[PDB]
Structure formats: structure tokens, C-alpha cells
């Protein structure tokens, strides 16, 4: 069978890439083999020799930092998605339509991803900041090691609500489940998610097919189906 593509995938984009890989494999005959986790954790793994050949980041600074450190194919970095951040519980109406629960709520645990490694976690800390609520919300925070773990804390009842990726609650034009407030962008840095071809993916055929496929129509339609822009 054809060249495989080792892809490091930021946790928010787990479900999206699983769906992309099926059509990608159907369409190119290259196999996408993915690992899922926090962006900063892949920065570490990639610096240490991880076999990954493509890196789908939840930010743009980290693929850019890797390029200025000699780990990236120049000309390879592009934006493949722009995410959105939402406050969310599976309990309906608990997270009101204007996010007033943050200001008046009585919750004890507020799930965010580790903002030192997970950009959807950093967007959460930015928004609390610009919302004027950092000092009051700080003690209630509970950090997952990536945005999938933060979401599971909420989904499992280990916290009353959390800042989750829109990708995890959104399908086909709508939040699908529980209670959400869409964080308005003026509160955090836009979640520009960049891809990059790493040194081990230079002159690999699965890798070029993959970045070209992520810019194609089957890919673009699925990415928009999960609430991402462009
Ligand atoms: N959990």
C-alpha cells in the first residue's frame, strides 16, 4: 500500500481528522495515522524526534516557533481551520444564552484545558481576563491535559461547565447538545489553527497529498460541518 502519513493532531481536531482520514484514504490510498493531544506536548515530542511528518496545530505561533527552530519545511505552514470557544454544560439552560452563569453562577469547578500547552485553554484564560473575571474564576478552574480532557470533565460530571472547543458540541449549523454560550471573539485571540510539514515529511508523498487534501473540497466541507471557519 502507499506511503503512510504520521500526523500530530491537536486534540480539538480529533473527530474532524478521523472523518477526514476515511475520505482521504478512500481518495488518495494514503493512510493517515494520527496521534491526539495538546499542541505544546507535540512541540516537545517533535523537538525530541517523534516520527510525525505532518502537524495540525490548534494555534499558529507553535508551528511558527518550530520553523524558527529548524524543524519545519519552509513554505509549508498554512491555516487549515479557525476554531471557536464555547462555554458548555450537558445540562440544558444551566449555561444561559448570554453566559451570565460565569458572573452569577454558584459552580465550584470550571473546566479549561491546560493553557500552557493547549491553545483552546489559552483562549479561555484570555476571555476570563478581558471579561474582568480572572481573579474570581481562578480558584474554580480545573485543567485537563488538552481540550478533549477538559470537555470530558464536563461530560462526565467532574465539573459543572467548561470552556470547550466548538468542534466538540457542534454539528450541521448548530450546537447539538446541552447548553452553550459562544464566546465572542473580541475576548481572546482568534483561534487560527495552522498546519506545517515537519522535517520527516519533506519529500514524503502521503504528507504532500495530505496538506493538498486539507485544502480540497471534501476536507473544507467537513471542517465547516464541525463549526470551523475557512
Ligand atoms: N473525565
Numbering used by the authors: 22 to 251
Report text from the authors:
Acquisition of the trace-element molybdenum via the high-affinity ATP-binding cassette permease ModABC is essential for Pseudomonas aeruginosa respiration in anaerobic and microaerophilic environments. Molybdenum, which predominantly occurs as the oxyanion molybdate (MoO42−; henceforth MoO), is imported via the high-affinity ATP-binding cassette (ABC) permease, ModABC in P. aeruginosa. Pseudomonas aeruginosa PAO1 ModA has a non-contiguous dual-hinged bilobal structure with a single metal-binding site positioned between the two domains.
Metal binding results in a 22° relative rotation of the two lobes with the oxyanions coordinated by four residues, that contribute six hydrogen bonds, distinct from ModA orthologues that feature an additional oxyanion-binding residue. In this study, we investigated the interaction of P. aeruginosa ModA with oxyanions of the group 6 elements: Cr, Mo, and W. By combining biochemical, structural, and molecular dynamic analyses of ModA-metal complexes, we show that the SBP is permissive for binding all three oxyanions at the primary metal-binding site. Despite E. coli ModA having a high affinity for MoO, it has been shown to be permissive for binding to tungstate (WO42−; henceforth WO), the oxyanion form of tungsten (W), a group 6 element with similar chemistry to molybdenum. In P. aeruginosa, exposure to WO reduced MoO acquisition, which was attributed to competition between the two metal ions for the ModA SBP and the inappropriate sensing of W by ModE, thereby leading to repression of the modABC operon. The result was a depletion in cellular Mo, with concomitant impacts on nitrate reductase activity and inhibition of anaerobic growth in WO-supplemented media.
